[PDB]
Structure 1
Amino acid sequence: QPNPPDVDAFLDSTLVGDDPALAAALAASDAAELPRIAVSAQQGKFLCLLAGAIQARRVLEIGTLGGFSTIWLARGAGPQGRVVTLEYQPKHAEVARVNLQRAGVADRVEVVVGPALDTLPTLAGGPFDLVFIDADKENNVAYIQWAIRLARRGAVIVVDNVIRGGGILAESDDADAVAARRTLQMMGEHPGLDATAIQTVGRKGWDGFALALVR
Structure 2
Amino acid sequence: SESQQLWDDVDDYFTTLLAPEDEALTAALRDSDAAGLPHINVAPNQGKLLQLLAEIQGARRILEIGTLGGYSTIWLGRALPRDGRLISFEYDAKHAEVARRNLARAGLDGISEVRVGPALESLPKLADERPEPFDLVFIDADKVNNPHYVEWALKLTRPGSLIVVDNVVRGGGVTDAGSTDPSVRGTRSALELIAEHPKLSGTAVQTVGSKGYDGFALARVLP
State whether TM-score is above 0.5: yes
| Partner residue in 2 for 1:103 | 106
Q: Deviations over 1:119-162 (max 9, x none)?
A: 10121331101100001111111100000100011100001011
Counterparts of 1:207 and 1:72, CA distance in 2: 20
| 2:198 paired with 1:191 | yes
Mark the runs of 5 or more structure 1 residues left unpaired by the alignment. Answer: none
Change in Cα spacing, 1:200 to 1:86, as seen in structure 2 (3 Å) is same
How do 1:31-42 residues align onto structure 2 when only pairs under 5 Å count? 31-42=34-45
Structure 1 stretches of at least 4 aligned residues deviating more than 4 Å after TM superposition: none
User: Quick check: 1:49 aligned with 2:33?
Assistant: no
Question: Is the 2:20–2:44 contact (alpha carbons within 8 Å) kept by the matching residues of 1?
Answer: no
Identity across the alignment (%): 56
Is residue 63–residue 134 contact of structure 1 (8 Å, CA) maintained in 2? yes
Q: Is residue 144 of structure 1 aligned with residue 150 of structure 2? A: yes
- Say whether 1:158 aligns with 2:164: yes
| Residue-pair matches, total | 215
- Mapped to 2, the partners of 1:18 and 1:214 lie a distance apart of 31
- Provide the TM-score with structure 2 as the length reference: 0.91
Deviation at 1:3? 1.4
Q: CA RMSD in A?
A: 1.5
Q: What is the distance in 1 between the residues matched to 2:17 and 2:203?
A: 28
In structure 2, what is the equivalent of residue 23 of structure 1?
26
Aligned partners of 1:38 and 1:161 also within 8 Å: no
TM (norm. structure 1) is 0.94
8 Å contact 1:134–1:159 — kept in the other structure?
yes
- What residue in structure 1 maps to residue 220 of structure 2? 213
